Amino acid sequence: KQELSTSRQILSSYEFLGPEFEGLVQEYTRLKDKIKDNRWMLQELSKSLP
């Protein structure tokens, strides 16, 4: 009950920066996820050179 109360207090400070910020955060998050996927794909092709 104490941990839930602290986390809910911090989230309330970011939610105050508007929908536009949330859009940016969503975009950033999407891009980081694609970079992570491409790096992961390059690593898997090198192990296969027999």
């Binding site: 940016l24 950033y28 970079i35 390059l42």
Partner: protein
Amino acid sequence: AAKEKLNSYLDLAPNPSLVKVKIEEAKRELKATEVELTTKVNMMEFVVPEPSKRRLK
């Protein structure tokens, strides 16, 4: 449910202008990793004769 919603916000300074810069940096990094992935794919072609259709060594 409340902690998971907080970890998505931490790499981003609460400043929109600075976030746009981080987004542009992430777009450059995505183009470089895509070129490296295409080159390694082409060298793929020549090596010749011979052995069946088949073989070990």
